[PDB]
Design a binder for this molecule. Sequence first.
Ligand SMILES: [Mg+2]
Lengths: 222, 233, 231, 244, 221, 250, 240, 235
Amino acid sequence: QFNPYGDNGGTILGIAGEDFAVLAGDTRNITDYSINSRYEPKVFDCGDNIVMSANGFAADGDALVKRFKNSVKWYHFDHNDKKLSINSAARNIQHLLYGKRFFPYYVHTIIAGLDEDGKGAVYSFDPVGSYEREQCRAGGAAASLIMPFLDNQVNFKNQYEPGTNGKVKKPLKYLSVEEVIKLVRDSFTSATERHIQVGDGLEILIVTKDGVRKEFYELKRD
Amino acid sequence: TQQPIVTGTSVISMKYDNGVIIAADNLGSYGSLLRFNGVERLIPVGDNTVVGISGDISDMQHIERLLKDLVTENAYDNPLADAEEALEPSYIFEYLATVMYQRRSKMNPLWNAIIVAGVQSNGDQFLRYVNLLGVTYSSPTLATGFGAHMANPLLRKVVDRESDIPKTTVQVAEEAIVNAMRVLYYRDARSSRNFSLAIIDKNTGLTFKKNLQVENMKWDFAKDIKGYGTQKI
Amino acid sequence: NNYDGDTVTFSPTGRLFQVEYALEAIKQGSVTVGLRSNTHAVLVALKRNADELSSYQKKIIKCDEHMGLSLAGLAPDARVLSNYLRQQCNYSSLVFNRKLAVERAGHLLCDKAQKNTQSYGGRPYGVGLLIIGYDKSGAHLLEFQPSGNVTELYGTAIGARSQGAKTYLERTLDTFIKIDGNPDELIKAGVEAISQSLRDESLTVDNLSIAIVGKDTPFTIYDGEAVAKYI
Amino acid sequence: GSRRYDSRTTIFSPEGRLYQVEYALESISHAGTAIGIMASDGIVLAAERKVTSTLLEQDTSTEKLYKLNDKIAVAVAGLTADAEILINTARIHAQNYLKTYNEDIPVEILVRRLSDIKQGYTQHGGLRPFGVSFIYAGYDDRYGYQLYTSNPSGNYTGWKAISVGANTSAAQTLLQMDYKDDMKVDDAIELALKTLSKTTDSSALTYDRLEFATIRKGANDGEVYQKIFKPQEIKDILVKTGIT
Amino acid sequence: DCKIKIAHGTTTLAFRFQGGIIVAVDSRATAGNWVASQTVKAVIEINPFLLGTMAGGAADCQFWETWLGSQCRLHELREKERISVAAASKILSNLVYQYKGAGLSMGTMICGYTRKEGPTIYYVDSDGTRLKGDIFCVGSGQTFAYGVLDSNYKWDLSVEDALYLGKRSILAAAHRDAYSGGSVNLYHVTEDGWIYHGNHDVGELFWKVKEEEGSFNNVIG
Amino acid sequence: MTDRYSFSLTTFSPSGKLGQIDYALTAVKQGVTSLGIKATNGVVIATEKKSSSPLAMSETLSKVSLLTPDIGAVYSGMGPDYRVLVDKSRKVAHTSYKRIYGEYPPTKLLVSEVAKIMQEATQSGGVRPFGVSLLIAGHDEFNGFSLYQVDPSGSYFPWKATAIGKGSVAAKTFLEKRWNDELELEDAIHIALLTLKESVEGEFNGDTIELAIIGDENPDLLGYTGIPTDKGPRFRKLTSQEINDRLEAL
Amino acid sequence: GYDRALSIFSPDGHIFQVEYALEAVKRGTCAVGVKGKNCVVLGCERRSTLKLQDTRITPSKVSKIDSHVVLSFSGLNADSRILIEKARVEAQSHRLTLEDPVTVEYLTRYVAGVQQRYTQSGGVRPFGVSTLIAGFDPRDDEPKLYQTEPSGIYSSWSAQTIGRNSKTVREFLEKNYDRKEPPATVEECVKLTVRSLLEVVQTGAKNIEITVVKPDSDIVALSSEEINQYVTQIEQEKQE
Amino acid sequence: DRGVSTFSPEGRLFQVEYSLEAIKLGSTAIGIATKEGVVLGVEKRATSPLLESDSIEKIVEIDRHIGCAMSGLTADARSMIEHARTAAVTHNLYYDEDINVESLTQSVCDLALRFGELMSRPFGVALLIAGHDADDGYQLFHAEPSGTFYRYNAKAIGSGSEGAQAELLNEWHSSLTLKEAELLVLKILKQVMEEKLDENNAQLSCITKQDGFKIYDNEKTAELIKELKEKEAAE
Ligand SMILES: [Mg+2]
């Protein structure tokens, strides 16, 4: 019997700073035990300082990104070139995903950018549209590997102040763009070591008030 | 819901410095029966694109008709149909990619794996894959079916990344493709010796080669192999 | 007279009066000018107001990053037709990853307007459009009329007193066509062209409306203080 | 287009009247007179056939009086073909009600639905109204014996005695004169015939130019019987009342 | 495993008492045994007088309860009057009933105050059940919440004691139920509307409650 | 495109007349004379075969039509309208009766179904009434022999004997004198031929006259044997020769 | 389907079909609505050219839409049944979804919306009917009286009349009805309603119908003798 | 007769032009836009004194940030308001934000020309749509049955529109306060109204960023009427 879904592997990662936000994702595309491409980008600039990735089944991921990009375009036409805020984009994506509630897009979607106060914002979605703003989110094949590391290093979970008898927690603070990229690079090199569907290359999209910058790094190709 | 009946095996391809090469054997298998031997599975669109198709042949012939009709439709009310407003590889691919995904979404897929190889108007090499699921990807080397498992490793030794493309000539690239076709003949049970090969160059244009054969094969060592273990005679 | 009740009826001399009456609505509309060089294509539009307390009716509409038009006549009809163009431009991008040719854009509008002139019940569109764009064959300017007739031009103008600007452009043809790699000078020529259709009124800061598209210039519209440079 | 040829059947006049309904009533006024008289122990339906020919088969004929179910009948005045369309609808509606509630349909409900159909033709659809007026004669366990009338407007009203078709003005005056509330069926039979005999446009009223029917409780114990009169039975009842 | 795992979320309760309505929920979402989130908002603030709790399918609940809020807004625009809790709940229950059998997974509670009704709680789930009631616990950890809530519930609880019992009941479920946890979100609904009573992380709340209350003796102190 | 005529083309005039029905009846008046007579043991229907041209083969054009094995029909007015009515009449006898009850409909009910079709052409959108009056003769077990007239309005009346079309006024008067309730079938055929000779002007023979009967069952015309209950069609069309035999002893 | 635009604008900006529907209302028998301090009364005329009527079974002029709301009308009788049926259905639908009976304003708004829809729908003519909708909202003791008309506009009235010679009875009510002090009791309200109809009717025998509606679904129709007592009382006071 | 969507020889739609005549017969409605807010006011015009004027609803809320006043065949406006409210709430559902006043007006105006041989005729009612958004601030739109809408600093529609508009031309300036705008609507309404202006036969409303759309009470308007009369007598 025909199976309409497939698993293209890979993994994605979104971190939010004070005045910036990053959305990273490896460039490997796979099916079963074969590599389809070592460089197939799945993190996209969608305009209005919104970066997006829909990891999982690539055909569904591409369709979704394509539809959202188109949603941004028509938002400009119908509302006098108004900038689509990150919170508005998130809600719009929920309706895109839930629209196919009974024949879902097999993807974990993450978007990143700046909120209306200029502060860094990351939103994450399940396959059928449930969404939530967070400081931190990993998605895809190696999400289970990366996410707990982010809880520890970004949100300082299970870390207490030395000598305080485990009474005072390590205080939350925003990370610099330099410190965040260090965590992203280490998260992906670690995930590459232990997950077969992750590797080849790492592409990071950073979002500041100035615009959308890109950074690329090599990953192990085995 | 479909099951493929008459099928075509591997389509292989790669980029080189000035263009792209694509190849596919001339077999139409009917299960284990090698039923049809005169099947062309590379279909040129204009003088700048070649679509290589594997999987169900009835669906391949449908796709042929769509591409044929696309050329006709593009010519309508288009004075620049053989110039600026000619069909690009990227246009042809996106159309097919749209169809493939729409058909999978209706649970009635075109049971194929497709590789659109060509050269754009600005000289850039185009090589992209799409299949029955609507899954798309691009790479310096692309291959379907058994080609993915056996050809890609061999072709990636020539062009392992983007920076290796300018360093790869058409002579070196074609040699690797022809070699890969031999390896597939050794090891793919639903392959044939006869195949077609197409080169799309930004300078010399489209060169379509028919009725090629796998040659320079190594079979001599077989005579020395006796039994399956102990047997000496 | 007896042959203008609906669009489905021909007159004894072979005229479609409802189509001609639709054409009349364009002549009542405010003037707009279109012109192009080899690198850029410009739309200039005189916006109209109800009174001093009202805003000035927006004449120019964007269709894609590389295409858009100016209107003259029934504005709601321009919205229907511009929306259709937006969809057709968009269909070309999603399906074929291809920017819609300005010539095809005209062919699609022609055929959409035509169907409304051959069937009972419906009515012709009551608006004229000047479509500009930059595609794979360079800059373009089209004139749409609701009879269905679409025409590609170097320059033109439609609306009330459009004959003045159309004469000027006919004289200036050799000059402005060669304004290549110079946006501001091509606009200046368009602003001077529309000025030949002015009576009693002059071009003010919230009256003028300019739009431009070109080689390395997306379709953008200029209004308010952004057109003060050209007065 | 086709607008040119549209009569616009469902519009108002400047005076606030429905042209087609008014003209349909004018048609009905030339139809054979039909009388309904309701007594305490039954209902009479009498109707005059439209100018009979001697070679018309009289015994196996049905023009005026139709049976809707076992408890309800109707007298027709207007276009017979139009009436039969409505009658078959009314017959179906009665059976739908019985199938749904396992109870014979109350007379008014049947009348209302049939009248609502006529109303629809005057408000929408662009079609001509049904050129028919009915006299409904029926019985149910709620209101007992009932007489109603509906017309092309879809408006219906209840009556003790009523006439439709031709000479209703003259007929209604005669009924209003001789009718009284404590009347019996046999008396109502006589009144129905005497009224027709005076209002008729014919020279003399005869058996062959009449349709007659009663709805009595004259059956055995607490049950209603419908009697559609035979030619010979009309001949006898005409002699018995001293008209011929 | 086969098929995608979608987020399934949260243990919720809400009980009626002398001083109005308490509503308490946890913040954990799970995809199988994977803890997907610990910061989920399982309470929707429909309006200043109306709350909606979420349990089961995260998307189903999040989508249809925000949709419910739009329908309630349209009601007060059309009728110039705030919608009744009964009517609000029935819009949602009639909606899911149209999707009955399609596979929606929702366990919700529409809590609020109006003049005509007073404080009212309606349980509404995805198989069409709609029940008015004083006490309800819904979600994977509902039984654990019931155990603590029922054994300590009286109508004459104070606002302070009621807020704590709701918080303590979620904590109980958060502890025992593997698919519940993260943090507790408290709400108090009065005649004047709903009042938010903070986010309480179980990480600190458990030990704070253990020490002060002397409970949770099963756990190594 | 599409049928935009969803409105009635037949409407009431201020005087209460339905114009198109009246005008349809006028078309019937212009039509050739046809008649029907009912006997004790049968029914006869007859009409003149007005030939459009002597080159035309009048045998191919059948004015008298079989609807069921026991029911026949003849008309006056517009031939094309009649033809399509016969097609519809035959089909409705199967769809709305025989496919339900496993037997052919009685005369009155088939007539009723034909009347319904003609009534709808009086009220439905974008159509004119049928320009014909039908005479339908037939037999059935429980009603016996019967003869019905059907007008453009959809109204139908049972007749002992009647005529329609060109010389119907005179023909009806002739039938009143000759008709009695003791008429045998042969006597009714004789009277039918006498009545028709008055209205016919040119040639009067078996080739210009079309005449059929509803009489006894015809086992010879059934086409098969073996089922005792199936005894054959009561409808029989008289041949050209059979008519001429009766014209000698006239 | 029949698509013709029957209700359309004319050069002077009038929709004649809607205005001709108002003429049909003007032809109809008079109907009056008067609301007191704790009640509403709906008075209705019945023309006396119809004798030999059966008043048991003849459709009554005042119709119950729900147990707490009533609807009277003026104009085409057949048209009124269609509005009443729709209103009765919507009443039960409102109870089913909102779990609360309709307010009088809501029911009026619905009926008015139906009337409006028929003024700009293809293939249909406007309703030749104006209605008086009266009653009490659930758990409320404030009397409600609304009027609708073919165009679709609706509004609340302290007292109102519609139908033939309605301008005469409206003239009567305009001077006799005090806003500051409405009819305090049921008797006072019924009397004012009967008085207003006696300006127009003819005889106070079987020509006047009166229906009294009170809070909490308390509706009752008065009999001939009960109404005749008001007629007898008013005439004796008049001779002065 | 003749087609519904027919053009006149001058190039106008007959039915649209005839609907504009219906709007001239309607009761007056005035709107004034300021930097402190937008004010909307209407003439109620009760046909009879027995009619309870408070039930005359000619000013209407579309959303918290958008209000609406009407003039003409007011029954036709119900489906327009219903659509506007749905459009406003639906956009909030899809985009988690308030909808632009211009976008709302455009959505309403798209219904306008959806008639022919869709509904059978154009709307016989004009709307003044006032609101506020973050981008373009306080706005006032005039939405016609032609499908056209103009933004206005101030605008009057109805029977006394041309007389009121000429008055608004002189009186309006860019530095008008909200209080000044309220009085100006009342002043101009009193000038064009047939019957004498009071709190019962005229209604005021406004929309501010802070408090949203608010219809004024009869008690509040009465004081503004009294304040207006005193200020005119003061010079
Ligand atoms: Mg790896």
